[PDB]
Protein backbone atom coordinates (compact mmCIF):
# COMPACT_ATOMS: atom_id res chain seq x y z
CA UNK A 280 0.00 0.00 0.00
CA UNK A 281 2.91 2.34 -0.74
CA UNK A 282 1.51 5.62 -2.07
CA UNK A 283 2.66 9.19 -2.63
CA UNK A 284 1.50 11.52 0.14
CA UNK A 285 3.03 14.69 -1.35
CA UNK A 286 5.04 15.68 -4.40
CA UNK A 287 6.17 18.82 -6.17
CA UNK A 288 9.12 20.96 -7.15
CA UNK A 289 11.74 21.93 -4.56
CA UNK A 290 15.15 23.58 -4.46
CA UNK A 291 17.75 21.20 -3.04
CA UNK A 292 21.31 22.16 -2.16
CA UNK A 293 23.96 19.90 -3.62
CA UNK A 294 25.46 17.45 -1.16
CA UNK A 295 29.02 17.60 -2.53
CA UNK A 296 28.82 20.64 -4.84
CA UNK A 297 26.99 23.23 -2.74
CA UNK A 298 24.63 24.91 -5.20
CA UNK A 299 20.84 24.95 -5.33
CA UNK A 300 19.06 22.92 -8.01
CA UNK A 301 15.37 22.48 -8.88
CA UNK A 302 14.26 18.92 -8.12
CA UNK A 303 10.93 17.11 -8.27
CA UNK A 304 10.56 15.30 -4.94
CA UNK A 305 8.33 12.37 -4.00
CA UNK A 306 7.21 11.81 -0.41
CA UNK A 307 5.81 8.32 0.17
CA UNK A 308 4.07 6.72 3.15
CA UNK A 309 6.94 4.24 3.59
CA UNK A 310 9.33 7.08 4.49
CA UNK A 311 11.23 7.53 1.23
CA UNK A 312 11.81 11.17 0.23
CA UNK A 313 13.60 11.12 -3.14
CA UNK A 314 14.06 13.90 -5.70
CA UNK A 315 14.54 13.75 -9.46
CA UNK A 316 15.73 16.14 -12.15
CA UNK A 317 12.32 15.76 -13.83
CA UNK A 318 9.09 13.98 -13.02
CA UNK A 319 9.60 10.20 -13.37
CA UNK A 320 7.46 7.95 -15.53
CA UNK A 321 7.40 5.13 -12.96
CA UNK A 322 5.91 6.08 -9.60
CA UNK A 323 7.34 3.27 -7.43
CA UNK A 324 10.10 0.88 -8.51
CA UNK A 325 9.93 -2.73 -7.35
CA UNK A 326 13.30 -2.83 -5.58
CA UNK A 327 13.41 -2.48 -1.80
CA UNK A 328 13.54 1.03 -0.31
CA UNK A 329 16.87 2.51 0.73
CA UNK A 330 17.38 4.07 4.15
CA UNK A 331 19.55 6.84 2.68
CA UNK A 332 16.35 8.62 1.60
CA UNK A 333 14.11 7.56 4.49
CA UNK A 334 12.42 10.14 6.72
CA UNK A 335 11.89 7.87 9.75
CA UNK A 336 13.17 9.43 12.99
CA UNK A 337 14.11 12.75 11.40
CA UNK A 338 14.44 16.23 12.87
CA UNK A 339 12.78 19.04 10.92
CA UNK A 340 14.40 22.48 11.14
CA UNK A 341 13.07 25.67 9.57
CA UNK A 342 15.82 28.24 9.00
CA UNK A 343 16.14 31.64 7.33
CA UNK A 344 19.89 31.13 6.77
CA UNK A 345 21.68 30.85 4.46
CA UNK A 346 18.50 31.35 2.41
CA UNK A 347 15.00 32.27 3.64
CA UNK A 348 12.25 29.62 3.52
CA UNK A 349 14.81 26.86 4.05
CA UNK A 350 13.97 23.62 5.82
CA UNK A 351 16.45 20.94 6.83
CA UNK A 352 15.89 17.20 7.29
CA UNK A 353 18.39 15.81 9.80
CA UNK A 354 18.79 12.09 10.45
CA UNK A 355 21.18 9.77 12.26
CA UNK A 356 21.99 6.93 9.86
CA UNK A 357 24.02 4.26 11.66
CA UNK A 358 26.68 6.49 13.24
CA UNK A 359 26.71 9.51 10.89
CA UNK A 360 24.45 12.56 11.10
CA UNK A 361 23.41 13.57 7.57
CA UNK A 362 21.59 16.74 6.57
CA UNK A 363 19.50 17.56 3.51
CA UNK A 364 18.58 21.23 3.07
CA UNK A 365 15.73 22.41 0.85
CA UNK A 366 14.15 25.70 -0.19
CA UNK A 367 10.68 26.70 -1.37
CA UNK A 368 9.59 30.09 -2.64
CA UNK A 369 6.86 30.78 -0.06
CA UNK A 370 6.61 30.12 3.70
CA UNK A 371 3.21 28.51 3.10
CA UNK A 372 4.83 25.83 0.92
CA UNK A 373 7.46 25.08 3.57
CA UNK A 374 4.78 24.43 6.20
CA UNK A 375 2.89 22.07 3.87
CA UNK A 376 6.09 20.13 3.19
CA UNK A 377 7.30 20.05 6.81
CA UNK A 378 3.88 18.98 8.11
CA UNK A 379 3.60 16.21 5.51
CA UNK A 380 7.16 15.07 6.23
CA UNK A 381 6.47 15.09 9.97
CA UNK A 382 3.23 13.10 9.64
CA UNK A 383 5.00 10.46 7.55
CA UNK A 384 7.77 10.22 10.15
CA UNK A 385 5.27 9.98 13.01
CA UNK A 386 3.29 7.37 11.08
CA UNK A 387 6.45 5.27 10.82
CA UNK A 388 7.11 5.47 14.58
CA UNK A 389 4.74 2.51 15.07
CA UNK A 390 33.37 -1.25 33.84
CA UNK A 391 29.70 -2.25 33.92
CA UNK A 392 29.12 0.94 31.94
CA UNK A 393 31.88 2.09 29.60
CA UNK A 394 33.22 5.62 30.18
CA UNK A 395 35.74 7.89 28.50
CA UNK A 396 38.21 6.99 31.28
CA UNK A 397 38.61 3.47 29.87
CA UNK A 398 40.33 4.85 26.76
CA UNK A 399 43.57 6.73 26.12
CA UNK A 400 43.44 9.50 23.52
CA UNK A 401 46.01 9.03 20.75
CA UNK A 402 45.26 11.09 17.64
CA UNK A 403 42.51 13.13 16.00
CA UNK A 404 41.23 11.46 12.84
CA UNK A 405 38.72 14.11 11.77
CA UNK A 406 36.52 17.02 12.81
CA UNK A 407 32.99 17.61 11.56
CA UNK A 408 30.09 19.97 12.06
CA UNK A 409 28.36 17.65 14.55
CA UNK A 410 31.38 16.22 16.37
CA UNK A 411 34.77 14.61 15.82
CA UNK A 412 36.47 11.23 15.39
CA UNK A 413 39.55 10.26 17.40
CA UNK A 414 41.91 7.29 17.51
CA UNK A 415 41.90 5.77 20.99
CA UNK A 416 43.25 2.72 22.81
CA UNK A 417 41.33 0.77 25.44
CA UNK A 418 43.58 0.70 28.50
CA UNK A 419 42.57 -2.81 29.59
CA UNK A 420 43.13 -4.60 26.27
CA UNK A 421 45.56 -2.37 24.39
CA UNK A 422 43.39 -2.63 21.28
CA UNK A 423 42.94 0.44 19.09
CA UNK A 424 39.59 2.01 18.22
CA UNK A 425 38.06 4.94 16.38
CA UNK A 426 35.63 6.87 18.59
CA UNK A 427 32.97 9.09 17.02
CA UNK A 428 32.07 11.80 19.53
CA UNK A 429 28.82 13.42 18.37
CA UNK A 430 26.78 16.24 19.88
CA UNK A 431 23.71 14.85 21.62
CA UNK A 432 21.39 17.82 20.99
CA UNK A 433 21.61 17.18 17.24
CA UNK A 434 20.55 13.53 17.35
CA UNK A 435 17.94 12.77 20.03
CA UNK A 436 16.01 15.02 22.42
CA UNK A 437 15.59 12.75 25.47
CA UNK A 438 18.30 11.06 27.54
CA UNK A 439 16.09 7.97 27.92
CA UNK A 440 15.92 7.48 24.14
CA UNK A 441 19.68 7.95 23.72
CA UNK A 442 20.31 5.19 26.27
CA UNK A 443 18.17 2.85 24.18
CA UNK A 444 20.09 4.16 21.15
CA UNK A 445 23.47 3.19 22.60
CA UNK A 446 21.98 -0.07 23.87
CA UNK A 447 20.40 -1.13 20.56
CA UNK A 448 23.02 -0.06 18.02
CA UNK A 449 25.75 -2.26 19.51
CA UNK A 450 23.71 -5.42 18.79
CA UNK A 451 21.90 -4.41 15.56
CA UNK A 452 23.59 -6.83 13.12
CA UNK A 453 26.84 -4.87 13.15
CA UNK A 454 28.91 -7.85 12.01
CA UNK A 455 29.96 -8.69 8.48
CA UNK A 456 33.58 -9.93 8.40
CA UNK A 457 34.75 -7.07 6.13
CA UNK A 458 32.92 -4.15 7.78
CA UNK A 459 34.49 -2.37 10.73
CA UNK A 460 32.36 -3.45 13.68
CA UNK A 461 30.79 -1.04 16.17
CA UNK A 462 31.81 -2.41 19.56
CA UNK A 463 30.74 0.02 22.31
CA UNK A 464 28.26 2.87 22.51
CA UNK A 465 27.89 5.19 25.48
CA UNK A 466 26.98 8.80 26.17
CA UNK A 467 28.05 11.71 28.33
CA UNK A 468 25.85 14.67 29.28
CA UNK A 469 26.22 16.40 25.89
CA UNK A 470 28.01 13.84 23.67
CA UNK A 471 27.12 10.57 21.95
CA UNK A 472 30.03 8.17 21.43
CA UNK A 473 30.39 5.30 18.95
CA UNK A 474 33.48 3.11 19.39
CA UNK A 475 34.52 1.13 16.31
CA UNK A 476 37.20 -1.49 15.80
CA UNK A 477 40.27 -0.01 14.12
CA UNK A 478 42.26 -2.28 11.82
CA UNK A 479 46.01 -2.30 12.48
CA UNK A 480 47.14 -3.85 9.18
CA UNK A 481 47.78 -0.52 7.46
CA UNK A 482 45.66 1.69 5.21
CA UNK A 483 45.20 0.39 1.69
CA UNK A 484 46.51 3.59 0.11
CA UNK A 485 49.71 3.04 2.09
CA UNK A 486 50.13 -0.49 0.75
CA UNK A 487 49.20 0.46 -2.81
CA UNK A 488 51.57 3.44 -2.89
CA UNK A 489 54.67 1.48 -1.85
CA UNK A 490 53.95 -1.49 -4.14
CA UNK A 491 52.71 0.95 -6.84
CA UNK A 492 50.42 -1.66 -8.47
CA UNK A 493 48.58 -4.80 -7.39
CA UNK A 494 48.42 -7.78 -9.69
CA UNK A 495 45.07 -8.89 -11.05
CA UNK A 496 45.15 -11.80 -8.58
CA UNK A 497 45.64 -9.55 -5.55
CA UNK A 498 43.03 -7.04 -6.73
CA UNK A 499 40.54 -9.86 -7.39
CA UNK A 500 40.90 -10.89 -3.74
CA UNK A 501 40.23 -7.45 -2.26
CA UNK A 502 37.56 -6.82 -4.89
CA UNK A 503 35.76 -10.04 -4.00
CA UNK A 504 35.68 -9.09 -0.32
CA UNK A 505 34.33 -5.63 -1.16
CA UNK A 506 31.61 -7.18 -3.34
CA UNK A 507 30.65 -9.47 -0.46
CA UNK A 508 30.47 -6.55 1.98
CA UNK A 509 28.46 -4.36 -0.42
CA UNK A 510 26.06 -7.25 -1.09
CA UNK A 511 25.37 -7.45 2.65
CA UNK A 512 24.64 -3.73 2.98
CA UNK A 513 22.36 -3.69 -0.07
CA UNK A 514 20.33 -6.85 0.55
CA UNK A 515 20.43 -7.22 4.35
CA UNK A 516 20.59 -3.54 5.37
CA UNK A 517 19.04 -1.76 2.34
CA UNK A 518 21.72 0.95 2.59
CA UNK A 519 24.05 2.32 -0.10
CA UNK A 520 27.57 3.03 1.15
CA UNK A 521 28.30 5.89 -1.29
CA UNK A 522 31.78 6.64 0.15
CA UNK A 523 33.69 3.71 -1.37
CA UNK A 524 37.25 4.93 -2.01
CA UNK A 525 40.80 3.79 -1.36
CA UNK A 526 41.03 6.00 1.75
CA UNK A 527 38.17 4.03 3.36
CA UNK A 528 39.84 0.63 2.89
CA UNK A 529 42.13 -1.00 5.44
CA UNK A 530 43.57 -4.44 6.17
CA UNK A 531 43.28 -6.24 9.48
CA UNK A 532 46.19 -8.16 11.01
CA UNK A 533 45.52 -11.15 8.73
CA UNK A 534 45.33 -9.17 5.48
CA UNK A 535 41.56 -9.13 4.90
CA UNK A 536 39.75 -5.99 3.77
CA UNK A 537 37.95 -3.78 6.28
CA UNK A 538 35.60 -1.09 4.98
CA UNK A 539 35.72 1.77 7.49
CA UNK A 540 32.96 3.95 8.94
CA UNK A 541 34.98 6.84 10.35
CA UNK A 542 33.42 9.66 8.33
CA UNK A 543 31.50 12.69 9.54
CA UNK A 544 29.57 15.34 7.64
CA UNK A 545 31.58 18.55 7.31
CA UNK A 546 30.96 21.90 5.67
CA UNK A 547 33.18 22.06 2.61
CA UNK A 548 35.88 24.51 1.58
CA UNK A 549 35.28 27.52 -0.67
CA UNK A 550 36.21 28.33 -8.02
CA UNK A 551 36.77 31.29 -5.73
CA UNK A 552 33.30 31.47 -4.12
CA UNK A 553 32.16 27.88 -4.76
CA UNK A 554 31.94 25.56 -1.74
CA UNK A 555 33.04 22.01 -2.58
CA UNK A 556 32.87 19.32 0.09
CA UNK A 557 35.70 16.81 -0.01
CA UNK A 558 37.39 15.40 -3.07
CA UNK A 559 35.30 14.52 -6.17
CA UNK A 560 37.62 11.94 -7.75
CA UNK A 561 35.59 8.95 -6.51
CA UNK A 562 32.04 10.30 -6.81
CA UNK A 563 29.62 8.59 -9.17
CA UNK A 564 28.27 10.90 -11.90
CA UNK A 565 24.68 10.67 -10.64
CA UNK A 566 25.97 11.75 -7.22
CA UNK A 567 27.87 14.72 -8.68
CA UNK A 568 24.74 15.88 -10.54
CA UNK A 569 22.46 15.57 -7.46
CA UNK A 570 20.26 13.16 -9.44
CA UNK A 571 18.47 10.21 -7.87
CA UNK A 572 20.83 7.36 -7.06
CA UNK A 573 20.69 3.80 -5.79
CA UNK A 574 22.78 0.68 -5.28
CA UNK A 575 24.69 1.33 -8.52
CA UNK A 576 26.68 4.12 -6.83
CA UNK A 577 28.71 1.57 -4.84
CA UNK A 578 29.55 -0.39 -8.00
CA UNK A 579 30.99 2.77 -9.54
CA UNK A 580 33.03 3.16 -6.36
CA UNK A 581 34.15 -0.44 -6.72
CA UNK A 582 35.23 0.42 -10.26
CA UNK A 583 37.35 3.37 -9.11
CA UNK A 584 39.03 1.25 -6.43
CA UNK A 585 39.63 -1.70 -8.76
CA UNK A 586 40.95 0.64 -11.46
CA UNK A 587 43.51 2.24 -9.15
CA UNK A 588 44.65 -1.12 -7.75
CA UNK A 589 45.30 -2.69 -11.16
CA UNK A 590 46.51 0.44 -13.00
CA UNK A 591 48.27 2.34 -10.20
CA UNK A 592 46.41 5.54 -11.08
CA UNK A 593 43.07 7.21 -10.43
CA UNK A 594 40.72 6.74 -13.42
CA UNK A 595 39.95 10.44 -13.91
CA UNK A 596 42.23 13.19 -12.65
CA UNK A 597 42.68 16.91 -13.23
CA UNK A 598 43.70 19.69 -10.87
CA UNK A 599 40.81 21.91 -11.97
CA UNK A 600 37.49 20.83 -10.46
CA UNK A 601 35.59 22.18 -13.47
CA UNK A 602 37.64 20.00 -15.82
CA UNK A 603 37.42 17.07 -13.39
CA UNK A 604 33.61 17.10 -13.34
CA UNK A 605 33.59 16.93 -17.14
CA UNK A 606 36.08 14.05 -17.00
CA UNK A 607 33.84 12.17 -14.55
CA UNK A 608 30.62 13.17 -16.32
CA UNK A 609 31.63 12.98 -20.01
CA UNK A 610 35.10 11.56 -20.75
CA UNK A 611 35.20 7.78 -21.15
CA UNK A 612 37.59 5.67 -19.09
CA UNK A 613 40.78 4.55 -20.82
CA UNK A 614 42.88 1.53 -19.91
CA UNK A 615 46.59 0.70 -20.17
CA UNK A 616 47.47 -2.10 -22.57
CA UNK A 617 48.72 -4.19 -19.63
CA UNK A 618 45.16 -4.99 -18.52
CA UNK A 619 43.61 -8.21 -19.75
CA UNK A 620 40.16 -8.25 -21.33
CA UNK A 621 38.49 -9.58 -18.18
CA UNK A 622 39.88 -6.69 -16.13
CA UNK A 623 38.85 -4.26 -18.88
CA UNK A 624 35.38 -5.81 -19.21
CA UNK A 625 34.78 -5.52 -15.47
CA UNK A 626 36.21 -2.01 -15.13
CA UNK A 627 34.33 -0.65 -18.15
CA UNK A 628 31.15 -2.30 -16.87
CA UNK A 629 31.58 -0.79 -13.41
CA UNK A 630 32.39 2.69 -14.75
CA UNK A 631 29.50 3.13 -17.18
CA UNK A 632 28.14 6.65 -16.81
CA UNK A 633 24.48 5.58 -17.00
CA UNK A 634 23.60 3.80 -13.73
CA UNK A 635 20.78 1.84 -15.40
CA UNK A 636 23.39 0.39 -17.80
CA UNK A 637 26.13 -0.06 -15.18
CA UNK A 638 27.32 -3.51 -14.14
CA UNK A 639 25.33 -4.33 -11.02
CA UNK A 640 22.77 -1.60 -11.68
CA UNK A 641 19.98 -4.03 -12.55
CA UNK A 642 17.60 -5.78 -10.19
CA UNK A 643 20.11 -8.58 -9.50
CA UNK A 644 22.58 -6.09 -7.94
CA UNK A 645 25.75 -7.88 -6.76
CA UNK A 646 25.00 -11.16 -8.55
CA UNK A 647 25.74 -9.59 -11.94
CA UNK A 648 29.24 -8.84 -10.64
CA UNK A 649 29.75 -12.17 -8.87
CA UNK A 650 29.00 -14.03 -12.13
CA UNK A 651 31.26 -11.77 -14.20
CA UNK A 652 34.11 -13.69 -15.81
CA UNK A 653 36.70 -11.65 -13.90
CA UNK A 654 35.54 -13.44 -10.72
CA UNK A 655 35.46 -16.88 -12.34
CA UNK A 656 36.71 -19.55 -9.95
CA UNK A 657 35.75 -17.49 -6.89
CA UNK A 658 33.63 -19.49 -4.46
CA UNK A 659 31.53 -16.77 -2.86
CA UNK A 660 30.68 -18.73 0.29
CA UNK A 661 34.43 -19.13 0.91
CA UNK A 662 34.83 -15.35 0.59
CA UNK A 663 32.33 -14.63 3.37
CA UNK A 664 33.84 -17.31 5.63
CA UNK A 665 37.40 -15.98 5.08
CA UNK A 666 38.55 -19.38 3.81
CA UNK A 667 40.59 -17.65 1.10
CA UNK A 668 44.14 -17.03 2.26
CA UNK A 669 45.23 -13.38 1.85
CA UNK A 670 47.96 -12.86 -0.77
CA UNK A 671 49.67 -10.26 1.47
CA UNK A 672 50.36 -10.64 5.18
CA UNK A 673 50.81 -7.29 6.98
CA UNK A 674 53.93 -6.98 9.11
CA UNK A 675 52.23 -7.34 12.49
CA UNK A 676 52.12 -10.21 14.99
CA UNK A 677 49.16 -9.04 17.09
CA UNK A 678 46.29 -6.57 16.94
CA UNK A 679 48.00 -4.47 19.60
CA UNK A 680 51.04 -4.27 17.31
CA UNK A 681 51.46 -0.58 16.50
CA UNK A 682 53.82 -0.86 13.52
CA UNK A 683 51.50 0.89 11.05
CA UNK A 684 51.07 3.65 13.64
CA UNK A 685 54.83 4.15 14.17
CA UNK A 686 57.07 6.51 12.17
CA UNK A 687 57.94 3.72 9.75
CA UNK A 688 54.63 4.87 8.24
CA UNK A 689 56.64 7.65 6.57
CA UNK A 690 58.43 5.16 4.29
Ligand SMILES: CCC(=O)Nc1ccc2[nH]c(=O)n(C3CCN(Cc4ccc(-c5[nH]c(=O)c(C)nc5-c5ccccc5)cc4)CC3)c2c1
Nearest residue numbers: 294295357359361458459520521522538539540544545556
Ligand atom coordinates in the same frame (compact mmCIF):
# COMPACT_ATOMS: atom_id res chain seq x y z
C1 LIG B 1 29.87 17.45 1.97
C2 LIG B 1 29.45 15.97 1.96
C3 LIG B 1 29.83 15.36 3.32
O1 LIG B 1 30.90 15.68 3.82
N1 LIG B 1 28.99 14.49 3.96
C4 LIG B 1 27.80 14.00 3.53
C5 LIG B 1 26.72 14.74 3.04
C6 LIG B 1 25.56 14.05 2.69
C7 LIG B 1 25.47 12.72 2.84
N2 LIG B 1 24.48 11.86 2.58
C8 LIG B 1 24.91 10.65 2.91
O2 LIG B 1 24.26 9.61 2.81
N3 LIG B 1 26.16 10.74 3.38
C9 LIG B 1 27.09 9.70 3.89
C10 LIG B 1 26.43 8.82 4.95
C11 LIG B 1 27.44 7.79 5.44
N4 LIG B 1 27.93 6.97 4.32
C12 LIG B 1 28.90 5.99 4.83
C13 LIG B 1 28.28 4.92 5.47
C14 LIG B 1 27.13 4.33 4.96
C15 LIG B 1 26.54 3.25 5.62
C16 LIG B 1 27.10 2.74 6.79
C17 LIG B 1 26.50 1.66 7.45
N5 LIG B 1 25.11 1.75 7.66
C18 LIG B 1 24.44 0.72 8.31
O3 LIG B 1 23.22 0.80 8.50
C19 LIG B 1 25.15 -0.39 8.74
C20 LIG B 1 24.49 -1.42 9.39
N6 LIG B 1 26.48 -0.46 8.53
C21 LIG B 1 27.17 0.51 7.91
C22 LIG B 1 28.54 0.27 7.77
C23 LIG B 1 29.29 -0.06 8.90
C24 LIG B 1 30.65 -0.32 8.80
C25 LIG B 1 31.29 -0.26 7.57
C26 LIG B 1 30.54 0.06 6.43
C27 LIG B 1 29.18 0.31 6.53
C28 LIG B 1 28.25 3.35 7.30
C29 LIG B 1 28.84 4.42 6.64
C30 LIG B 1 28.60 7.83 3.33
C31 LIG B 1 27.63 8.84 2.76
C32 LIG B 1 26.49 12.03 3.33
C33 LIG B 1 27.62 12.63 3.68
